[PDB]
């Protein structure tokens, strides 16, 4: 019963920031206009800059964006929001700030009660039960890896198994397989750049032109393509 | 500009050079730093996909020709007494989060740090190099378990980013390594991050932390362009 748009990344090569997300958002808004933006993953730009940028790209869709860090009452802003938008950046800082401010549970409940959730990269991580499949660096301790638990599977965004020539460090699949040792019940979706999962009207729909990979404990990786229903 | 470092550390970026055997490039470094030491305790907890017995036996086998006797801390009767009596503490690669989680849960983190401060040789590669730093905030590993705190052994005062490379797959739009490091420098602007490439190491001996290995090392500090360093540099 939830409405989610989970993008692997913000920008296709040669396209504008979030350009490819606009028609997917447009199709899912279903009349919604009031959005709260969660900027906390952003580290190297200010949250005001991040919010203005998000407001700018969504304005032609009719969406009104409010940055949650600039309202007096963030709980009431989330409560009245029709759309919750969670930007990319560092996943640990995103989760840490969301938990410290007491926003994690209100965000999840607002989405469960009907609000549209849009997240890309780090914001796709946050929608999963935990952030255990992020690729980000642990620059801050989020005091727990549990996240919004809006999508039941673990998404690994920016998925690629390519490595630089001669690299001897862990491959992406090797890192995921280690997670499957410690948490053997999990399904990990290797969601490549360019792809997304859109949960709407009772269906979780894989989208994007690139091959998606599913990892489960003890099973060879499974290739999926756009149109798969989870 | 580090002051005198009183610990004996060997911090390897990685275990295996291309075309070489596991730890092959480390053997002359270990041998020449042993300084008469023979008794080693191996910390296997980073290993996920191999058993800690297998990991320990592999480590014991490869170091036995150096005269080093290896026991795995997970199978000794008394892990606190084993650390106290160890001449060498060896921390293997694997998942850094699990390594730190197990070390903390078992109450070994402080005894390991204290034994090294009191004279023991510390050898770590990859995850074991991360663990020697004040925190694991510069690991490249995936957070597969929560270690209940990112503070680590604090034996080496600077942050090591092992396996350092700024190269990315064709067309990739995700964060570059330097960008991930620059974000850490926003939240912790006092830090020095050493981009330690594969093949390289940091050896702390006779009071000096000396860079080793044939590849270029890059140092990142807040608001400063990356600095290129080569073998022989003293931190």
Swiss-Prot record, chain B:
Family matches, as SUPFAM superfamilies: Class I glutamine amidotransferase-like
InterPro entries listed in its UniProt record: Class_I_gatase-like (IPR029062), Peptidase_S51 (IPR005320), Peptidase_S51_dipeptidase-E (IPR023172)
Cellular component, GO annotation: cytoplasm
Organism superkingdom: Bacteria
A GO molecular-function descriptor: serine-type peptidase activity
Disulfide bonding pattern of the chain: none
Keywords: Cytoplasm, Dipeptidase, Hydrolase, Protease, Serine protease
Entries under Pfam families matching the protein: Peptidase_S51
GO biological process: proteolysis
EC number(s) reported in the record: 3.4.13.21
Cytoplasm recorded as keyword: yes
Function statement: Hydrolyzes dipeptides containing N-terminal aspartate residues. May play a role in allowing the cell to use peptide aspartate to spare carbon otherwise required for the synthesis of the aspartate family of amino acids.
PANTHER family: ALPHA-ASPARTYL DIPEPTIDASE, PROTEASE S51 ALPHA-ASPARTYL DIPEPTIDASE
Protein's recorded name: Peptidase E
Encoding gene per record: pepE
């Amino acid at each position: 019963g939830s409405e989610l748009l989970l993008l692997s990344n913000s920008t296709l090569p040669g396209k504008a920031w979030l350009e490819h997300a606009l028609p997917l958002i447009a199709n899912q808004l279903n009349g919604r206009r009031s959005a709260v933006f969660i900027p906390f993953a952003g580290v190297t730009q200010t949250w005001d800059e991040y919010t203005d940028k998000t407001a700018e790209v969504l304005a032609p869709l009719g969406v009104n964006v409010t940055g949650i860090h600039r309202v007096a009452d963030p709980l009431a802003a989330i409560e009245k929001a029709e759309i919750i938008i969670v930007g990319g950046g560092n996943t640990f800082q995103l989760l840490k700030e969301s938990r410290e401010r007491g926003l994690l549970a209100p965000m999840a409940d607002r989405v469960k009660r009907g609000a549209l959730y849009i997240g890309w990269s780090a914001g796709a991580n946050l929608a999963c039960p935990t952030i255990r499949t992020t690729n980000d660096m642990p620059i801050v301790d989020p005091n727990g890896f549990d996240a919004l638990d809006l999508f039941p599977l673990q998404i690994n965004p920016h998925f690629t198994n390519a490595l630089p020539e001669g690299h001897k460090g862990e491959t992406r699949e090797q890192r995921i397989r280690e997670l499957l040792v410690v948490a053997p019940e999990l399904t990990v979706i290797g969601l490549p750049e360019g792809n997304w999962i859109q949960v709407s009207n009772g269906q979780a729909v894989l989208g994007g032109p690139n091959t998606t990979w599913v990892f489960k404990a003890g099973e060879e990786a499974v290739a999926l393509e756009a149109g798969h229903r989870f």
